[PDB]
Amino acid sequence: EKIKLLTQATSEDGTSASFQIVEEDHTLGNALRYVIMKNPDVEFCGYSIPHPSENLLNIRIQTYGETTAVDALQKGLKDLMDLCDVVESKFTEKIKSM
Amino acid sequence: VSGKTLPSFKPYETDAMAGGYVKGRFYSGIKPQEYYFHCMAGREGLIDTAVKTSRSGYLQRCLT
Amino acid sequence: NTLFDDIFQVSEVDPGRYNKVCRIEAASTTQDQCKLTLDINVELFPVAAQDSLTVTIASSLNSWRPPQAGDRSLADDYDYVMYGTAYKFEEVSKDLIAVYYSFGGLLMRLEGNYRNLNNLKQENAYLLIRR
Amino acid sequence: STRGQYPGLYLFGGHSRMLRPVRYLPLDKEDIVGPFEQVYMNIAVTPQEIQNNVHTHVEFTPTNILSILANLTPFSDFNQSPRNMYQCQMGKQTMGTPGVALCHRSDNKLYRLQTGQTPIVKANLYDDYGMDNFPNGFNAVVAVISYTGYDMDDAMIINKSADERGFGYGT
Amino acid sequence: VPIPGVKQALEKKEGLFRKHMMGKRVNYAARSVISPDPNIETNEIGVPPVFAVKLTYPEPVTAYNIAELRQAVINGPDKWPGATQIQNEDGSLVSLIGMSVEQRKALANQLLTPSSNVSTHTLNKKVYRHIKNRDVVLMNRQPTLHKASMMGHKVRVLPNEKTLRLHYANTGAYNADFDGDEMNMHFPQNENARAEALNLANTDSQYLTPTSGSPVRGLIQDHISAGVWLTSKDSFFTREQYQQYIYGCIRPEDGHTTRSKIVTLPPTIFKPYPLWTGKQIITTVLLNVTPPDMPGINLISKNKIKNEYWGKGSLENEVLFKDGALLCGILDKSQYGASKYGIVHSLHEVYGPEVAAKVLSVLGRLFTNYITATAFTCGMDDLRLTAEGNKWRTDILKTSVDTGREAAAEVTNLDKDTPADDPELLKRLQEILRDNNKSGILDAVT
Amino acid sequence: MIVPVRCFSCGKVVGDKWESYLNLLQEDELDEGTALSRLGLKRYCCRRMILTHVDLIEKFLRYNPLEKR
Amino acid sequence: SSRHGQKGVCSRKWPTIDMPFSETGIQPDIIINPHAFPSRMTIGMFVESLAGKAGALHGIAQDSTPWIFNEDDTPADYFGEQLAKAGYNYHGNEPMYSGATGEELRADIYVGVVY
Amino acid sequence: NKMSPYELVQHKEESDEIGGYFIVNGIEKLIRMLIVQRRNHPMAIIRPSFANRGASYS
Amino acid sequence: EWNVEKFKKDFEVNISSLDAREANFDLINIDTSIANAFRRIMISEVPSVAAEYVYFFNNTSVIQDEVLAHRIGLVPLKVDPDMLTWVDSNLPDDEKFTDENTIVLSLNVKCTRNPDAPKGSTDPKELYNNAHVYARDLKFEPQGRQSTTFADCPVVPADPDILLAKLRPGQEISLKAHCILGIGGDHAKFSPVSTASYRLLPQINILQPIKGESARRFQKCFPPGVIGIDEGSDEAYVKDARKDTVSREVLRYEEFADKVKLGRVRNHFIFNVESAGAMTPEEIFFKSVRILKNKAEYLKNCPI
RNA sequence: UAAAUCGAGAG
Ligand SMILES: [Zn+2]
């Protein structure tokens, strides 16, 4: 129950969906939103905090077809991981020099 | 009674500032006489604010 | 398909307390009756006084979606493309029609002879600027 | 005077009179004046505003017309007068330092600020009354910004981390 | 001074008619200092956990109810949502306070047990459940000068602090600031008073005051300047910014939108790169909140900022909604806010009150999220004048060195140019001062 | 009362720089700004931590119930 | 409250990562809306913020007894020159970044030190 | 009365303790200064209530 | 078509300095979303160690127990956070703390008057013994196997001169502090970074040549190592834009009001990380990027 | 468990 699909927003086709994540803020949400907005198949992506006092985050993902919103979320998570990995590799390489 | 608006103004002085005309602004501050006059105005405003609330409840009570 | 074509000489550019947009007054070089005022963001398409602009109003470019590789449009032949709605028509006098377009809040007033502007309707339209 | 106050010379030396120090311009000395004595002579509020043959006194400083609380508000001549009155009202209601002998008191109720600070901006009279012995508030980095949305009418936002570091803690 | 009699116990205020019959003290009511809260639906009240634990409602147990009431009984009196008491058919009031979880499960499993007594066979038990998110509450702030100062709000319970959190739009009717102001929440204990607060005292029904028909609800201070900046001509937003601004306020899982899918608009500028506009943000907000199978709004109105404040040839003073799309003008206090014939007033008149309330909430969230990314500030630079402005001010104020003397000369009937120390002028000024009527015209002419 | 352990605004530890600040002001005839700079307090959020401390605890300490006077 | 009658209750203890942060790395411990000054006219609070930042930067204390300044030597000029001699800008504004989005704000933010 | 601040601290009072207040039942009280008419000065008064002191009263 | 390969080709790190308490480096061609995520994770999410619980046995001093416990919680401990695990809140207070997740500190200081004090002395060091209580007085008591794994690096406050309390004869403080693993988003005492923040690279665009004496005035409006007069011809150029704050003092003069523009390189961040002492800033940034990667991985591996 | 009166405050 870390991340949940909101059935009041998901479509029977599967292209449009809303995900609610517990214990998140504008830290994972902003990065994930940008990284998945890099996806050419994604039409609409956004993140919203219902209330600041609750550790709940929402991501809305709607595609152009040919790809579900869950697949878009997976691609965004993998791309964010790879982005962090390359910044880690660059930092480690630069530490050795100076 | 002497005709002075303030100790620092000569009796019956024909000046706008003597009568309470503040040429200063809150950006550059106001002179002590202007400060005193503005304090008079603010105190009168607070007195009116206090006395206005007490002066209206009975009308609404009687009407209601 | 195209609904209006012309070339305009820009007379003045007044910033008007805006850091990105400007209001452009331009007079057509072919017909003396055709004048145009137009709000354009000069951060992207900068203009200056005494500048010749090729202006084209079209009905389409042949929902929206960001372009992919190998996308064919009428926008390729022009530099600055806006999309807007016509909301007002008026008659300056006999044989004079002024049409008002709103591109997301940026106003354009186009005044010209009713026979030159007869192709303009009260509909969505693309405004394309070149040079 | 024509239908004014009853004329005459009166001398008072009794108890309970209200007296304030003005500066007698001849001899450049200190004089003591009272309310009855004051309404007929002219005291210049500052030596730069003295006029010939019409002023006989000046005030040592125009800040001695104010009380302690009215003198302790910074840049008082720039605020609106109701705000100065409100500050004088709310300077007596802070959770500051009542005293240092609290171990031997037995008061019914007491509020104490754990860590007070001296102001960076303060009047010269602040040190004359030893207000440093009784701190009242804290110096705070204050951003005048419309950013949060939770402070519009009169509310304010406090940093959560600053709060957890003792900013404003009390007993 | 003497002992009051029977008459003295009834006659005046603090008697028995005005103090214990027309005005009484009530149960199931809390009082607290309010704090502001966006992210509240402008018809809701944010209640503290303490109030959510103390305040309760008697829900009779039924066949459709045992799913929630059993869990409420299990949760106990100190875990919201929970139950604090059980009323059997005979009237027994079994308290859940001093009981363990196992006893609570035993009691919960015996909620919908049919009665063994014929005298109460028509009755069912009641669970005094905690206040929930589907309950209504009567909010009132003294003095209650007009009826809009006592409304009905849908309860949302918050997890953190002991204040009643209230939306900014409600401050217009309550005349409430957040300067330590306090107010009272009342919990109706039957369905008859529930329906009244949800339909008659409902805060959605209170958009227009009955005094003159003017509205008394709308965004107040930060949102107005936020919308002045956002609906300007300089407001261009990339696709990511546009879509994030739209989803930040029209979340299609809380019922904020109608079409189950956030529909967007083609960008204003196609080349060189796609840019939207703030007026387009307003347009798509309206398009998402406005119900389908219905045309868009058509309004020609004005705002508070003259066209001269936007440069030459600007027409941003005239607001123009056409077919539900903002095409001109700035959204202002006169558009959203307690003001007549604005966009919100028109939406209320055309689409109903619930749509207008939803639009108020959406606009509040939108401007809150725009201000948190594009901040607004005031400083000492805003208060200054140029060198020429100060020169103009000094030159004009120097001409006032003779105003008082000229006014006095006019009142004293001296001709003009008379020196301030003219003995006749001084004599007549002294005469004027001694009179309350002549000095009343001297202080009016000057 | 006593010097705070950390600066409120940022969290930099400044509780180890109060006796040092007093000694810098006392022995070396320094102004407050230079003494604060030498202690490593750059941002004014940290500077007003030690610049404006009153150190009231000393006045508290003279009232000692546990020792005769 | 401040020493200029700007009373108000705390609304939310904003987590420090969500607060705006300046080019120097600091974040304010108090946020007061700019919409409280125009109707109250507490310019003394503005000039006290200016003087407080200047004094904290220079490690000095500025006296604020009324009527020490004139219409010629405005306190804004005095404290602005003090701020400029230390690097910060004349008007007391600072470039800040939103702690949520991470982008720089539209204009410089007025921030100082007040009691 | 004439105790130095050091002696005041030694007797648990305060560094700069000021008087002007009595202690009654452990509660500190003071007697507020009042404003009253100035002494030994006959001031002319035009007061309507004098007419209410009876008939033929100015 | 954005791709991780393109970002890997365009991303570059430019370290300007590196210390044991502060790292000032640069991140180029990265979106402010990722940079702000790194900043927030550094401030709020990378774990550290601080005294969470305090058990008091005697506090006869002039400081109340809650304030003293708060201060003891606010002193940074120089213990590498990797050496201990996380406690369980759902565990009972008996067995919640083990030798693998909690570090025990003890403070037992009793003040007493020094009889050999010099005559006519006012210094509280010559007068009293143990008058001042410092963080270095927090003795570390290794319990269990931590007596061996902490033998190479014993627990000691990062700043030992922190003044915890002041005492007078007869007054004493005896207490224990249990220090556990925690993050800065729970309480500000667990944040390992004294301050983490980036700033956009200032960009000074000279629109028109400022040749001549005015250049000296133009050079005067910036910090010294920013605007330089060209050696060949009297003319200004941007020597180094990292050394100026955005003060816009040049904007206050009508002479240069129309001859310069100030902007930012809005993908070029200068990160200045100042640590508290328990970790080096390079390891703090490494842990931040690792935390973001692990957060994304955990979100990816959870069933929907 | 109560009631007045006085005093101090908040909106
Ligand atoms: Zn700091």
Q: Determine the structural domain holding residue I71 and report its residue range.
A: 48-188
Q: How far is the CA of E177 from the C1' of J10 (A)?
A: 13
Is residue I158 located within the same domain as residue I249? no
Q: Which nucleotide is nearest to E180 (CA to C1')?
A: J11
Residues with CB under 5 Å of ion ligand 1 are F 7, 9-10, 12, 45-46
Q: How distant, in Å, are the alpha carbons of A46, C63, E258, E361, G83 from that of E262?
A: 10, 14, 9, 17, 49
Do β-strands G30-32 and D156-159 pair in parallel, antiparallel, or remain unpaired? antiparallel
Q: How far apart are CA D151 and CA G10, in angstroms?
A: 8
Residue G63, H or E segment:
strand G62-63
Other beta carbons within 10 Å of D59: 20
Q: How distant, in Å, are the alpha carbons of D33, D118, F35, F55, G60 from that of F31?
A: 43, 17, 6, 19, 8
Is residue I6 located within the same domain as residue I28? yes
Distance separating the N- and C-terminal Cα atoms of chain F: 23
Q: How far apart are CA F55 and CA D135, in angstroms?
A: 10
Per-residue tokens: E93: 């009031």
Residue type, G5: G
* CB-based contact E155:E136 (threshold 8 Å): yes
3-state SS assignment for residue F23: helix
E377/G93 Cβ within 8 A: yes
Residue to mutate among I70, I71, I195, with most D CBs inside 10 A, is: I70
Residues with Cβ within 8 Å of G33's Cβ and at least 6 positions away in sequence, in order, are: D144, D145, D146, D151, D152, D155, D156, E221, E222
Which of B21, B17, B6, B14 has its CA nearest to residue E408? Answer: B14
* CB-based contact G72:G44 (threshold 8 Å): no
* CB-based contact F6:F15 (threshold 8 Å): yes
Distance separating the N- and C-terminal Cα atoms of chain C: 21
Q: Determine the structural domain holding residue C16 and report its residue range.
A: 1-131
Q: Which chains touch H (3 or more CB pairs under 8 A)?
A: D, F
Cis, bond preceding E81 (omega within 30 deg of 0): yes
Q: How far apart are CA E395 and CA D133, in angstroms?
A: 49
3-state helix, strand, coil in chain I (%, to 5): 25, 30, 45
CATH, domain range E28-54+132-206: 2.40.40.20
* CB-based contact I160:I134 (threshold 8 Å): yes
Other beta carbons within 10 Å of F55: 14
Do β-strands D121-122 and G62-63 pair in parallel, antiparallel, or remain unpaired? parallel
* CB-based contact D45:D62 (threshold 8 Å): yes
Q: How far apart are CA E404 and CA D4, in angstroms?
A: 23
Ligand 1 centre and the CA of G26: distance in Å?
7
Verify if strand J has an atom below 7 Å from the CB of D94. Answer: no
Q: Which residues of B touch G70 (CB under 8 A)?
A: 28
Half-sphere exposure of I89 (CA within 13 A, CB side): 2
CA distance G45 to chain I (A): 22
Owner of token pair 């004079």:
C96
Which of I150, I191, I155 has its CA nearest to residue I276? Answer: I191
Owner of token pair 């007093």:
F22
3-state SS assignment for residue E183: strand
Is residue I222 located within the same domain as residue I175? no
Q: How far apart are CA I188 and CA C119, in angstroms?
A: 67
Q: Determine the structural domain holding residue F33 and report its residue range.
A: 1-66
| Residue C69: DSSP 8-state | T
Q: How far apart are CA E419 and CA H31, in angstroms?
A: 53
* Alpha helices, DSSP H, located in chain I: 4-10, 32-44, 65-73, 124-127, 146-149, 213-220, 281-300
Ligand 1 centre and the CA of F49: distance in Å?
8
Half-sphere exposure of D60 (CA within 13 A, CB side): 9
CA nearest E33 in G: which residue? Answer: G9
Q: Which domains does chain A show, CATH number per domain?
A: 1-98 (3.30.1360.10)
Q: How far apart are CA D144 and CA E104, in angstroms?
A: 53
Is residue I88 located within the same domain as residue I135? yes
Q: What is the DSSP string of E386-411?
A: -HHHHHHHHHHHHGGGGHHHHHHHHH
Phi, psi of E207 (to 5 degrees): -70, -40
Which of D167, H7, D61, G25 has its CA nearest to residue I43? Answer: G25
Which of E281, E278, E276, E277 has its CA nearest to residue E262? Answer: E281
Q: How far apart are CA D51 and CA E310, in angstroms?
A: 50
Q: Which nucleotide is nearest to D86 (CA to C1')?
A: J10
Do β-strands C21-28 and C2-14 pair in parallel, antiparallel, or remain unpaired? antiparallel
Q: Is residue G113 classed exposed, middle or buried when 0-12, 13-18 and 19+ CB atoms within 10 A define those classes?
A: buried
Q: How far apart are CA B63 and CA C4, in angstroms?
A: 69
Angle E403-412/E423-434 helices, nearest 10 degrees?
80
* CB-based contact I268:I32 (threshold 8 Å): no
CA distance B5 to chain D (A): 10
Do β-strands C106-112 and C21-28 pair in parallel, antiparallel, or remain unpaired? unpaired
Chain J nucleotides close to protein (CB under 7 A) are 4, 9-11
Residues with Cβ within 8 Å of A23's Cβ and at least 6 positions away in sequence, in order, are: A2, A55
Ligand 1 centre and the CA of D161: distance in Å?
12
CA nearest B33 in G: which residue? Answer: G67
Domain range E207-377, CATH class: mainly alpha
Q: Residue E165 pairs with which residues in a beta bridge?
A: E35, E46
Cα–chain center distance at D136: 14
* CB-based contact E370:E230 (threshold 8 Å): yes
* CB-based contact I196:I42 (threshold 8 Å): yes
CA distance D147 to chain I (A): 17
Residue to mutate among F14, F16, F68, with most I CBs inside 10 A, is: F16
G25/F33 Cβ within 8 A: no
Verify if strand J has an atom below 7 Å from the CB of D93. Answer: yes
Stated resolution in angstroms:
3.2
* CB-based contact I304:A21 (threshold 8 Å): no
Other beta carbons within 10 Å of E66: 16
Residues with Cβ within 8 Å of H53's Cβ and at least 6 positions away in sequence, in order, are: none
Number of H helices, E strands in chain A: 2, 4
Is D31 marked active-site?
no
Which of C68, C86, C76 has its CA nearest to residue C122? Answer: C86
Ligand 1 centre and the CA of I70: distance in Å?
18
**Residue I144 Ramachandran class (φ > 0 left, ψ -120 to 50 alpha, else beta):** left
Phi, psi of H50 (to 5 degrees): -60, -40
CATH value at residue I140: 2.170.120.12
3-state SS assignment for residue I38: helix
Ligand 1 centre and the CA of F39: distance in Å?
13
Q: Which residues of A touch I286 (CB under 8 A)?
A: 88, 91-92
Number of domains in chain C: 1
Is residue I17 located within the same domain as residue I74? no
Q: How distant, in Å, are the alpha carbons of G27, H22, I196, I275 from that of I16?
A: 24, 68, 16, 16
3-state secondary structure C111-129: EECCCCCCCCCCCEEEEEE
Q: How far is the CA of D84 from the C1' of J9 (A)?
A: 19
Tally C-beta pairs within 8 A across C and E: 100
Verify if strand J has an atom below 7 Å from the CB of D90. Answer: yes
Q: How far apart are CA I133 and CA I108, in angstroms?
A: 10
Q: Which chains touch D (3 or more CB pairs under 8 A)?
A: B, E, F, G, H, I
CATH value at residue I238: 3.30.1360.10
Q: How far apart are CA D44 and CA D58, in angstroms?
A: 5
Q: How far apart are CA E320 and CA E282, in angstroms?
A: 12
Phi, psi of D80 (to 5 degrees): -75, 145
Verify if strand J has an atom below 7 Å from the CB of E196. Answer: no
E-strand stretches of E296-439: 299-302, 318-322, 325-328, 376-377
| Residue E382: DSSP 8-state | G
Give me Rg for the CA atoms of chain G: 15
* CB-based contact G42:G105 (threshold 8 Å): no
Task: Report whether E435 belongs to an annotated binding site.
Answer: no
* CB-based contact D97:F56 (threshold 8 Å): yes
Which of I103, I96, I46, I42 has its CA nearest to residue I73? Answer: I103
Verify if strand J has an atom below 7 Å from the CB of E31. Answer: no
The shortest CB-CB distance from I194 to any of F12, F64, F67 is to F12
Owner of token pair 């600053």:
D162
Length of chain D, in residues:
171
Angle E353-371/E343-351 helices, nearest 10 degrees?
150
Q: How distant, in Å, are the alpha carbons of E47, E52, E141, E164, E183 from that of E161?
A: 9, 12, 20, 9, 16
Number of domains in chain F: 1
Q: Which residues of I touch G107 (CB under 8 A)?
A: none
Which of D97, D142, D145, D147 has its CA nearest to residue D117? Answer: D97
Other beta carbons within 10 Å of I264: 17
Residue E186, H or E segment:
strand E182-186
* Alpha helices, DSSP H, located in chain H: 5-10
Residues with Cβ within 8 Å of D46's Cβ and at least 6 positions away in sequence, in order, are: B32, D58, D59, D62, G67
3-state helix, strand, coil in chain F (%, to 5): 40, 5, 55
* CB-based contact C56:C12 (threshold 8 Å): no
Q: What is the DSSP string of A57-84?
A: EEEEEEESSSS-HHHHHHHHHHHHHHHH
Owner of token pair 């040839």:
E313
Owner of token pair 């029609």:
C97
F47/G59 Cβ within 8 A: yes
Verify if strand J has an atom below 7 Å from the CB of E181. Answer: yes
CATH value at residue C118: 2.40.50.140
Q: How far apart are CA I142 and CA I72, in angstroms?
A: 18
Owner of token pair 């003017």:
E214
Which of E348, E313, E344, E350 has its CA nearest to residue E331? Answer: E344
Q: How far apart are CA G69 and CA H53, in angstroms?
A: 56
Q: How far apart are CA D99 and CA D93, in angstroms?
A: 15
**Residue E42 Ramachandran class (φ > 0 left, ψ -120 to 50 alpha, else beta):** left
* CB-based contact D142:G49 (threshold 8 Å): yes
Task: Report whether E323 belongs to an annotated binding site.
Answer: no
Q: Residue I137 pairs with which residues in a beta bridge?
A: none
Q: How distant, in Å, are the alpha carbons of B5, B49, D55, E402 from that of B15?
A: 10, 30, 17, 8
Cis, bond preceding E143 (omega within 30 deg of 0): yes
3-state SS assignment for residue I9: helix
Long-range residue pairs from G70-77, CB within 8 A, at least 24 positions apart, any chain? G70/B28, G71/B24, G71/B28, G71/B29, G74/B27, G74/B28, G75/B29, G75/D75, G75/D78, G75/G47, G75/G50, G75/G51, G76/B27, G76/E380, G76/E383, G76/E384, G76/G47, G76/G50
CATH value at residue F16: 1.10.10.60
CA distance I300 to chain F (A): 34
Q: How distant, in Å, are the alpha carbons of I205, I234, I250 from that of I219?
A: 14, 12, 9
Scan residues 11-30 of chain E and list those with Cβ within 7 Å of strand J: 14
Q: Active site residue: D28, D77, D153, D154, which one? A: D154
Per-residue tokens: E97: 């306070």
Residue I57, H or E segment:
strand I48-59
Length of chain B, in residues:
64
Length of chain E, in residues:
446
Task: Give me the CATH topology for the region E55-131.
Answer: Dna Ligase; domain 1 (3.30.1490)
Per-residue tokens: E106: 């035993």
**Within chain G, what is the greatest distance between any pair of CA atoms?**
44
For residues C44-73, b (16+ Cβ closer than 10 Å) or e, as one string? ebebeeeeebebbbbbebeeeeeeeeeeee
* CB-based contact C27:C8 (threshold 8 Å): yes
CA nearest A33 in G: which residue? Answer: G101
Which of A3, A6, A9 has its CA nearest to residue A28? Answer: A3
Owner of token pair 């100065």:
D84
Q: What is the DSSP string of I238-268?
A: ES-GGG-----GGGG-TTSTTSEEEEEEEEE
* CB-based contact A74:A19 (threshold 8 Å): no
